[PDB]
mmCIF file of N, CA and C and ligand atoms in Angstrom:
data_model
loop_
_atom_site.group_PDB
_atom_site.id
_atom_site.type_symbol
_atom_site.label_atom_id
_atom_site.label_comp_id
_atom_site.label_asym_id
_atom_site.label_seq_id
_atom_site.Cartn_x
_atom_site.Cartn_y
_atom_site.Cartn_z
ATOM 1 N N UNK A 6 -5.671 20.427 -7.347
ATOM 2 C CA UNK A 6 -7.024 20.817 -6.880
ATOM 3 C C UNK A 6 -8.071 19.849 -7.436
ATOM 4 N N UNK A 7 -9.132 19.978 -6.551
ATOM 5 C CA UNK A 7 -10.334 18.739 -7.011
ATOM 6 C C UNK A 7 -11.307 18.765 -5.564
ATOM 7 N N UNK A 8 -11.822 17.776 -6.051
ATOM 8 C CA UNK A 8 -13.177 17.540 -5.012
ATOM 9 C C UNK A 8 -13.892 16.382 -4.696
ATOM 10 N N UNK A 9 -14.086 15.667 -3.570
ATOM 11 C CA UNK A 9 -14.938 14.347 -3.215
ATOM 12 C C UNK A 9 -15.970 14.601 -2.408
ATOM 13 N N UNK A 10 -17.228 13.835 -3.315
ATOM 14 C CA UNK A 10 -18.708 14.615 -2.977
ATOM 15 C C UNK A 10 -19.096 13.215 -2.404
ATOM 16 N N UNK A 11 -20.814 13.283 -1.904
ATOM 17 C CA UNK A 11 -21.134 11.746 -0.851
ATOM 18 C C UNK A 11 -22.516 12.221 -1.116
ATOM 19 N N UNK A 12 -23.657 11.664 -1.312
ATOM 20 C CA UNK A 12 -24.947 11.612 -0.532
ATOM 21 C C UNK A 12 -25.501 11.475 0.517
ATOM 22 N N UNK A 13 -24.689 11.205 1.194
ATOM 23 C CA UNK A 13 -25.115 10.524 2.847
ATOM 24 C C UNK A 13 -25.267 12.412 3.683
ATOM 25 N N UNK A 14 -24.651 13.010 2.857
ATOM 26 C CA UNK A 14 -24.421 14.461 3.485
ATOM 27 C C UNK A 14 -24.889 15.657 2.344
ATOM 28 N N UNK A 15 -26.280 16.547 3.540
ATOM 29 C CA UNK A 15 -26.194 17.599 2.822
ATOM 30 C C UNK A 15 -25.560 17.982 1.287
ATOM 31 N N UNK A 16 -25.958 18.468 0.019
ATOM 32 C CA UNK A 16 -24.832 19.109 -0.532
ATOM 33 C C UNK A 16 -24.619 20.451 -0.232
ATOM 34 N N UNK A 17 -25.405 21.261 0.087
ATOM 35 C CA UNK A 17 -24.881 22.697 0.710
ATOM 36 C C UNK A 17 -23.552 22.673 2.104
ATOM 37 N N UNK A 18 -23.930 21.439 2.924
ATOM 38 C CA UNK A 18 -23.020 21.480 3.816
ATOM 39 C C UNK A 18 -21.599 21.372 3.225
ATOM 40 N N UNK A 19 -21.216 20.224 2.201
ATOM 41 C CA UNK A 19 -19.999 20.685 1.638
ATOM 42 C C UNK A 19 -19.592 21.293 0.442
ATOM 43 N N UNK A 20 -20.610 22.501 0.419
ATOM 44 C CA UNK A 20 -19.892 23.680 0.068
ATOM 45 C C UNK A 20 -19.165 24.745 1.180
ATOM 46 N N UNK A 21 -19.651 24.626 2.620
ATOM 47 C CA UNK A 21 -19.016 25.218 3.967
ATOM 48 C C UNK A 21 -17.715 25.938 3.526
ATOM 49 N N UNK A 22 -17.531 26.961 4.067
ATOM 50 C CA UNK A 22 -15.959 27.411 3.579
ATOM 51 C C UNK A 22 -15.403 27.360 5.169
ATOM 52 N N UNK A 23 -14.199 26.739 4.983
ATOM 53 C CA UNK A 23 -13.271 26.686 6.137
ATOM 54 C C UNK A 23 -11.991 27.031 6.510
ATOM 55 N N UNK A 24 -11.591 27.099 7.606
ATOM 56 C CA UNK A 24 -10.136 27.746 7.328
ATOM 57 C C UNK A 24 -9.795 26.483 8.349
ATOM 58 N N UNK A 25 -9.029 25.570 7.930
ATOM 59 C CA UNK A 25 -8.112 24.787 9.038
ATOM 60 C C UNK A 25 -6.982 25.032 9.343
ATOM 61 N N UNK A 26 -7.134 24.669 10.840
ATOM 62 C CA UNK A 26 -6.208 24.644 12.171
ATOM 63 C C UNK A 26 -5.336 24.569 11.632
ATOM 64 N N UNK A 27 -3.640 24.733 12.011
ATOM 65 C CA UNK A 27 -2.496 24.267 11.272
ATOM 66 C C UNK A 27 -2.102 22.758 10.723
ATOM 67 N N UNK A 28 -2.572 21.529 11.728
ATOM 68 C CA UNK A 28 -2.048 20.038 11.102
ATOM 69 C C UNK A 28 -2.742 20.304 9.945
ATOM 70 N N UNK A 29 -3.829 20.367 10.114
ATOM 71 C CA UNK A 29 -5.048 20.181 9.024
ATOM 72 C C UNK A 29 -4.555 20.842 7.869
ATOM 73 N N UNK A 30 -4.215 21.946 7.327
ATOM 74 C CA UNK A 30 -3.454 22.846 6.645
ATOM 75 C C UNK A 30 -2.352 22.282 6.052
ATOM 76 N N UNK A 31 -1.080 21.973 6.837
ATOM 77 C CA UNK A 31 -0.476 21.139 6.585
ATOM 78 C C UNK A 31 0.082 19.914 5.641
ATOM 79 N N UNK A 32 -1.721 18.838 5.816
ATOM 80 C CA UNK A 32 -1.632 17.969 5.494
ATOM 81 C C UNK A 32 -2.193 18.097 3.732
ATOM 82 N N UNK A 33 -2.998 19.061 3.921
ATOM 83 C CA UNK A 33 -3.337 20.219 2.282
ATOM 84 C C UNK A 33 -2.164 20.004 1.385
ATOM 85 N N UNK A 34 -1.640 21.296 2.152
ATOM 86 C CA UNK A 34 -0.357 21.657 1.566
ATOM 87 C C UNK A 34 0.536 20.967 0.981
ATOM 88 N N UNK A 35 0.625 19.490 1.610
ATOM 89 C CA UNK A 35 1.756 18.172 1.324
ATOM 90 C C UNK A 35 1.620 17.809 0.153
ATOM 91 N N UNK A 36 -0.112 18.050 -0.681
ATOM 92 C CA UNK A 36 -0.133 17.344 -1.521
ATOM 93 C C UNK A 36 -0.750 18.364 -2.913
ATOM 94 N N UNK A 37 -0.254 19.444 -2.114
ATOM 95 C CA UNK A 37 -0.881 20.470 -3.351
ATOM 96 C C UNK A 37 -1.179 21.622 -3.710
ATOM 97 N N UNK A 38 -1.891 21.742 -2.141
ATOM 98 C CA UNK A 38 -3.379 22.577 -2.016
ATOM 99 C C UNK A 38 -2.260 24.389 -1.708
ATOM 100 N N UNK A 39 -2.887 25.313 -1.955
ATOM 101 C CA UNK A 39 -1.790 26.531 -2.059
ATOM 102 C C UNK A 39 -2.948 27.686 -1.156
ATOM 103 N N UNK A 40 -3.632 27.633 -0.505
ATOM 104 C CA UNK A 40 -4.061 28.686 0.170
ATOM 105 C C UNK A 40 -5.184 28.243 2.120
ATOM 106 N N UNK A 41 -5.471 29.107 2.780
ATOM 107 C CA UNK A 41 -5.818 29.840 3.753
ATOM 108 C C UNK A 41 -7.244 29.238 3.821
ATOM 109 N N UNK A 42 -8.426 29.195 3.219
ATOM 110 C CA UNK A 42 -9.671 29.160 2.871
ATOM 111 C C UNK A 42 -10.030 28.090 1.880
ATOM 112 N N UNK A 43 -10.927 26.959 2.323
ATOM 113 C CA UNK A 43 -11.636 25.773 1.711
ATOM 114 C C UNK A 43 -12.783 25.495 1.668
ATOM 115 N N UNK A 44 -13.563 25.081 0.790
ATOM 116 C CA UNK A 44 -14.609 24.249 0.973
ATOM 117 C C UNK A 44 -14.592 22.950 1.382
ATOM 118 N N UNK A 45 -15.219 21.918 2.151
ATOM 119 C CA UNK A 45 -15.666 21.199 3.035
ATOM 120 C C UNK A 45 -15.221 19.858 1.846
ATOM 121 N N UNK A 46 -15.714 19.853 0.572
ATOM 122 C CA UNK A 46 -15.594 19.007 -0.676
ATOM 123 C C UNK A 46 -14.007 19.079 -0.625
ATOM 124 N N UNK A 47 -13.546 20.027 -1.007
ATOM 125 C CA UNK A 47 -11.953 20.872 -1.118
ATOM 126 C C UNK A 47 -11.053 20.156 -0.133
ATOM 127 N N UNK A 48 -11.669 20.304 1.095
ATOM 128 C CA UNK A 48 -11.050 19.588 2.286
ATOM 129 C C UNK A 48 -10.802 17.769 1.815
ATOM 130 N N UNK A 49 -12.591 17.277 1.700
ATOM 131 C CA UNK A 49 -11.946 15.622 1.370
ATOM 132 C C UNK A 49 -11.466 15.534 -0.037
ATOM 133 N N UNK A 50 -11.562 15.935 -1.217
ATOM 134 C CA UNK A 50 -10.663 15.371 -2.143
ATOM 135 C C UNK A 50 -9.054 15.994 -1.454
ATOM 136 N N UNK A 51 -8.607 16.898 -0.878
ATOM 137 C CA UNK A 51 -6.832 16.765 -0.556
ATOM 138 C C UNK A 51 -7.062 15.626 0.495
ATOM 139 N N UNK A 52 -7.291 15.265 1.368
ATOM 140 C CA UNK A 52 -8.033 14.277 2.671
ATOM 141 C C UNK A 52 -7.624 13.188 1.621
ATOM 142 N N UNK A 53 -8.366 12.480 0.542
ATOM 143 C CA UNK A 53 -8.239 11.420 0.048
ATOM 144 C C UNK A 53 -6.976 11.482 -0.803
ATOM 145 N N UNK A 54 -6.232 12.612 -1.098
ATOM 146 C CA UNK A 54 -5.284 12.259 -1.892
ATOM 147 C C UNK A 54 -3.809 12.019 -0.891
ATOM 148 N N UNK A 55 -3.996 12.495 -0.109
ATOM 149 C CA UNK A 55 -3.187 12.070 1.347
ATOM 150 C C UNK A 55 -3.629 10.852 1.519
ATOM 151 N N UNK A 56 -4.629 10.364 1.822
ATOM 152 C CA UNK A 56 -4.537 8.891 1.784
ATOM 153 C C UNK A 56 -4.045 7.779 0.932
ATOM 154 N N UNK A 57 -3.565 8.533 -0.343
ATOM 155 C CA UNK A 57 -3.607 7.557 -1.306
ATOM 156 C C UNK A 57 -1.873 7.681 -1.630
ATOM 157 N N UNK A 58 -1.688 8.740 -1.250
ATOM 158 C CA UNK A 58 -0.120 8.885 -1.289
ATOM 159 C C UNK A 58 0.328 8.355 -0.247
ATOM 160 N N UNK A 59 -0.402 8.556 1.188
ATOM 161 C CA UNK A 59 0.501 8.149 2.185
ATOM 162 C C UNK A 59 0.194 6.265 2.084
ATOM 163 N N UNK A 60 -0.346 5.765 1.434
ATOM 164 C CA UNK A 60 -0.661 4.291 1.348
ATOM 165 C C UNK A 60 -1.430 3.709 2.387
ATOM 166 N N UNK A 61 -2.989 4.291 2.389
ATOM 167 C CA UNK A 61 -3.327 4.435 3.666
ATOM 168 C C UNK A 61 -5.190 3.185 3.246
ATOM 169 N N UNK A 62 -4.912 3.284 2.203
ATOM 170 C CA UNK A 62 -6.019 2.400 1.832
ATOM 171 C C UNK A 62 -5.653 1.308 0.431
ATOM 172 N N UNK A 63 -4.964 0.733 0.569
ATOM 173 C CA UNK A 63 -4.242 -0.350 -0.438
ATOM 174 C C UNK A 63 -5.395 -1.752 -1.110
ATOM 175 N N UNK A 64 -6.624 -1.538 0.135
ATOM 176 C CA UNK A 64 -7.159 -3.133 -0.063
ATOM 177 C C UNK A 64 -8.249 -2.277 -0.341
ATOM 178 N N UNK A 65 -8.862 -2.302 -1.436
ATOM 179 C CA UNK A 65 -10.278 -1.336 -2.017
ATOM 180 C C UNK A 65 -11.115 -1.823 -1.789
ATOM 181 N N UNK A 66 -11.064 -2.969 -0.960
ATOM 182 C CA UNK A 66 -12.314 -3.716 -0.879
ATOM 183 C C UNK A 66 -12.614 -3.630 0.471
ATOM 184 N N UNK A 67 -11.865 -2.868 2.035
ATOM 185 C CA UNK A 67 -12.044 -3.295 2.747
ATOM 186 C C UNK A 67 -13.033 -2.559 3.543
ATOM 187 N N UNK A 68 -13.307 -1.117 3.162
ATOM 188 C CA UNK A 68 -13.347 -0.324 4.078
ATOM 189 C C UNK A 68 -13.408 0.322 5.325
ATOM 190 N N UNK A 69 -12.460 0.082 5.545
ATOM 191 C CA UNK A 69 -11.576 0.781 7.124
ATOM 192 C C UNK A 69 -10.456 0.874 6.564
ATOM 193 N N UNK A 70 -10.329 2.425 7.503
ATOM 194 C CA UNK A 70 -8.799 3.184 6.952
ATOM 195 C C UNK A 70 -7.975 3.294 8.230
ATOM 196 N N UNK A 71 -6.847 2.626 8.275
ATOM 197 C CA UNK A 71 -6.078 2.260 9.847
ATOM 198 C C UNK A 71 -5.106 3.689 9.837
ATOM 199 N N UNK A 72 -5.510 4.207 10.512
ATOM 200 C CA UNK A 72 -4.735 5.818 10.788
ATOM 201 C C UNK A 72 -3.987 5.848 12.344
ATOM 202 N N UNK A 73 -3.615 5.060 13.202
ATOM 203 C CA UNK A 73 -3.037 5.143 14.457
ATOM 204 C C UNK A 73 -1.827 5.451 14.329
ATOM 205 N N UNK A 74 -0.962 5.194 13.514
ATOM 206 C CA UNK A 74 0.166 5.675 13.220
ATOM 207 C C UNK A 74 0.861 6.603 12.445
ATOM 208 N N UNK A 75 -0.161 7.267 12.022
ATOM 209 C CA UNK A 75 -0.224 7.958 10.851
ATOM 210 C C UNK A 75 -0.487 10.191 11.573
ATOM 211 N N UNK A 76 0.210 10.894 10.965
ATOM 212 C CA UNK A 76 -0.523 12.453 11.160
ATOM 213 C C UNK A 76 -2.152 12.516 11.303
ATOM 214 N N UNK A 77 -2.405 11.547 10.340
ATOM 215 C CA UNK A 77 -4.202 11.396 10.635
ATOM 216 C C UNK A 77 -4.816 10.866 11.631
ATOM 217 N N UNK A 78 -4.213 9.772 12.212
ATOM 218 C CA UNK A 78 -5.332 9.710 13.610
ATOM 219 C C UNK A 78 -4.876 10.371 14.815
ATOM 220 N N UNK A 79 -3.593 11.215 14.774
ATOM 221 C CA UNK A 79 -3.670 12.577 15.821
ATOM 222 C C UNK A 79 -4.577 13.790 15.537
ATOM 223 N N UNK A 80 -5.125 13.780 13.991
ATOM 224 C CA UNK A 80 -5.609 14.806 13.631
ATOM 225 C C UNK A 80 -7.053 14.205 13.927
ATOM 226 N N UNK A 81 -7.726 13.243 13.618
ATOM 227 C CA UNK A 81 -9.014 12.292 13.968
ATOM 228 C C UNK A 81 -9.293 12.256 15.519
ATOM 229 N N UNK A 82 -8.079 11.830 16.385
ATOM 230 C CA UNK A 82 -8.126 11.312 17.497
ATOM 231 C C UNK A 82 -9.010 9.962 17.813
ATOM 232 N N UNK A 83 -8.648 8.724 16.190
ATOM 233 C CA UNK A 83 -9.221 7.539 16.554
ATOM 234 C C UNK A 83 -8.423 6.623 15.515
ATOM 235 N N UNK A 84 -7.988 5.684 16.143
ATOM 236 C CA UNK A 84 -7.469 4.558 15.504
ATOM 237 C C UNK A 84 -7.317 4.057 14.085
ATOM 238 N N UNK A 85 -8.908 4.130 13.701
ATOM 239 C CA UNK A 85 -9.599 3.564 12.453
ATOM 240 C C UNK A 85 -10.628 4.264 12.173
ATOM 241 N N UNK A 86 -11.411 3.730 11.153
ATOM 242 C CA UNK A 86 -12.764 4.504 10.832
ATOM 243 C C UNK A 86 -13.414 3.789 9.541
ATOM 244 N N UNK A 87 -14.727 3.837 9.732
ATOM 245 C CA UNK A 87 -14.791 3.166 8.480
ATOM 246 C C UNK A 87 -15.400 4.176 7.401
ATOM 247 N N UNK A 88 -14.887 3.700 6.107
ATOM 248 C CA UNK A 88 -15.120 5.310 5.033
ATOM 249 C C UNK A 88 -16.488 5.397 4.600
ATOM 250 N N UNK A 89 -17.234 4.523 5.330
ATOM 251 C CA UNK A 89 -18.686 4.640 4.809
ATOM 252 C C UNK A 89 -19.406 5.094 5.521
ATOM 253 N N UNK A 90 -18.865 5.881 6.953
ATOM 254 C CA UNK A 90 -19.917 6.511 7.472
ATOM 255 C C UNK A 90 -19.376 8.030 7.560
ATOM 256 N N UNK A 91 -19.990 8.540 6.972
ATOM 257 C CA UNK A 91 -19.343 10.087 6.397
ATOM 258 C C UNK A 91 -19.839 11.126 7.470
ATOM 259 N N UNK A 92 -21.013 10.760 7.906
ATOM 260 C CA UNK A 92 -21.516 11.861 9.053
ATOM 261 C C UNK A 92 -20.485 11.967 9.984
ATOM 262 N N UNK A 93 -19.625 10.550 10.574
ATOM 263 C CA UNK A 93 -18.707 10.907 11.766
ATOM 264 C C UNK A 93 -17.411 11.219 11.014
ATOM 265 N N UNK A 94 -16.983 11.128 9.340
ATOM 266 C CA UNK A 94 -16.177 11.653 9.038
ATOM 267 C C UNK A 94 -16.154 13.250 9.317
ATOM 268 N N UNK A 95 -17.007 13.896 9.195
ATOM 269 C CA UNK A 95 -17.111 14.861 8.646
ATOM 270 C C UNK A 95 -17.239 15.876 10.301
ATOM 271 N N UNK A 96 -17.757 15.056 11.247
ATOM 272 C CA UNK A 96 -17.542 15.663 12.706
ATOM 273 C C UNK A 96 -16.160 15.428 13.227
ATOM 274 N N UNK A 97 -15.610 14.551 12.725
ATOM 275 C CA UNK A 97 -14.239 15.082 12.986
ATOM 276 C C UNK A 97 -13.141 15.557 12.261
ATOM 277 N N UNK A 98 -13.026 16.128 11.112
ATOM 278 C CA UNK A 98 -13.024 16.807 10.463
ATOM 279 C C UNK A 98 -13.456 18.970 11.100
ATOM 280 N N UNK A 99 -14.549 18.787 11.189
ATOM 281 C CA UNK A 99 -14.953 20.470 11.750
ATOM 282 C C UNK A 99 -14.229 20.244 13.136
ATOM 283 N N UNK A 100 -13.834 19.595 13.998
ATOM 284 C CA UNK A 100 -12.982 19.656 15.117
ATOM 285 C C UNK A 100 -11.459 20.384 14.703
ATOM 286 N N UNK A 101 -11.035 20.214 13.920
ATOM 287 C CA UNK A 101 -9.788 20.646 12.911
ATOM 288 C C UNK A 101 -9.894 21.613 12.263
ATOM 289 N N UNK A 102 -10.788 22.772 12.458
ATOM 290 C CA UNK A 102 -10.842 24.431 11.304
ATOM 291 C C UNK A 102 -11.881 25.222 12.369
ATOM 292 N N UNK A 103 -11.707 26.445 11.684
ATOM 293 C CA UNK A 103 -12.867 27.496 12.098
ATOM 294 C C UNK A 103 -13.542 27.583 10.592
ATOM 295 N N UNK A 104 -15.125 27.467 11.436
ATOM 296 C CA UNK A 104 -16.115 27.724 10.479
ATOM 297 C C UNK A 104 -16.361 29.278 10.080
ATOM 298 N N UNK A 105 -15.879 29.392 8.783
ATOM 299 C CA UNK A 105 -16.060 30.475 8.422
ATOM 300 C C UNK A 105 -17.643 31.489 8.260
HETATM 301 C C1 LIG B 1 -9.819 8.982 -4.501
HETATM 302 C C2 LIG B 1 -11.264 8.534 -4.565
HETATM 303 C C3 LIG B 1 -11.455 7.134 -5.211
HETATM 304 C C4 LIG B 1 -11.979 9.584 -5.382
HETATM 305 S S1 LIG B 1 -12.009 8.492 -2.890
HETATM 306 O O1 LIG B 1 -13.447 8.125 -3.053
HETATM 307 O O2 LIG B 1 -11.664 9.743 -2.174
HETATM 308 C C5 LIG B 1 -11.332 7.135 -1.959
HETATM 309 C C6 LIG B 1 -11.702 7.239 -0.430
HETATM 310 C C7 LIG B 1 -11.005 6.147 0.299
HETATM 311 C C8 LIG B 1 -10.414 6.558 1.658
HETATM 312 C C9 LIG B 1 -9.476 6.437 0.421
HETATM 313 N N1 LIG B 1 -13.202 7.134 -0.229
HETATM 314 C C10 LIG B 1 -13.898 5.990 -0.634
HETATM 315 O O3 LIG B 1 -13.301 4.958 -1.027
HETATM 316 C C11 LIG B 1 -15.428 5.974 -0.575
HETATM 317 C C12 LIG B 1 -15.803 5.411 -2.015
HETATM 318 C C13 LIG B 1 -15.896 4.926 0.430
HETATM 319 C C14 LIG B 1 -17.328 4.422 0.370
HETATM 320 C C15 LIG B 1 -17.630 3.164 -0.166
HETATM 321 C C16 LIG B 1 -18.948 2.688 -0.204
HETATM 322 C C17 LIG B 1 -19.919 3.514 0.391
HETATM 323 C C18 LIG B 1 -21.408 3.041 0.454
HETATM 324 O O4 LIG B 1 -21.666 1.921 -0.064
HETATM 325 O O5 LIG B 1 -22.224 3.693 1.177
HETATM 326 C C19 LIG B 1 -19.554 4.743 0.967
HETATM 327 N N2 LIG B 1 -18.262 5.155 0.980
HETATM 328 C C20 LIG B 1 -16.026 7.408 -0.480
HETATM 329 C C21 LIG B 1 -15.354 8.198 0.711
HETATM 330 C C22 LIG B 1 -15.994 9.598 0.993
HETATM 331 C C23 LIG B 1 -16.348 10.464 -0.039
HETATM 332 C C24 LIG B 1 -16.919 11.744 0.211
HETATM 333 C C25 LIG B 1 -17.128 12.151 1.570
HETATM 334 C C26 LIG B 1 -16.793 11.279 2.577
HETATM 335 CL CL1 LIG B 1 -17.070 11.821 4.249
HETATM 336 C C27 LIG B 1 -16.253 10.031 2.340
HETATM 337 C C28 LIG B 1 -13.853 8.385 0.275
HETATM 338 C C29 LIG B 1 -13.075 9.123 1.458
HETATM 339 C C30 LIG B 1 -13.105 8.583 2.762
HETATM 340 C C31 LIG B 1 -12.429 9.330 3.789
HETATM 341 C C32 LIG B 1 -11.855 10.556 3.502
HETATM 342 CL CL2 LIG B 1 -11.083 11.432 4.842
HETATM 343 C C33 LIG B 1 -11.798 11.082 2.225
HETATM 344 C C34 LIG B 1 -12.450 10.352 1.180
#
């Protein structure tokens, strides 16, 4: 358990509690996470630790995260992305849960 916070976004927004869809859930679960109900923060620190297990960002310098082949860009529904724009992280992301 843990948490990855941003400025670019609200902080009340990721406190949001969510319940994700099953991939989304899933991809939690792979690396940890043990229940039903999340916060939005909750969501990207398991989000980034899946990335870091699945070897999904190796070059720290580059930012773009290549997900086409990956559970994540079926769950995204986009190729790539770059990690510095968090607003369209985070809209696709709520495509993947019910807002509690
Ligand atoms: C393990 C950590 C080092 C704690 S991490 O920060 O989670 C690493 C993770 C990368 C994808 C693996 N990640 C980043 O590297 C970061 C630092 C990339 C970054 C670099 C520079 C700037 C700027 O100059 O404006 C902004 N964003 C943060 C990113 C993140 C964090 C919180 C919310 C969001 Cl939506 C994104 C954040 C990230 C991006 C996408 C997702 Cl889905 C999850 C986390």
């Amino acid at each position: 358990d843990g948490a990855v916070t941003t400025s670019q976004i609200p902080a009340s927004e990721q406190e949001t509690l969510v319940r994700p869809k099953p991939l989304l859930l899933k991809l939690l679960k792979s690396v940890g996470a043990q229940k039903d109900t999340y916060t939005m923060k909750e969501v990207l620190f398991y989000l980034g630790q899946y990335i870091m297990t699945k070897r999904l960002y190796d070059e720290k310098q580059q930012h773009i995260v290549y997900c086409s082949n990956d559970l994540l860009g079926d769950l995204f529904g986009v190729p790539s992305f770059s990690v510095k724009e968090h607003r369209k992280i985070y809209t696709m992301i709520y495509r993947n849960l019910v807002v509690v």
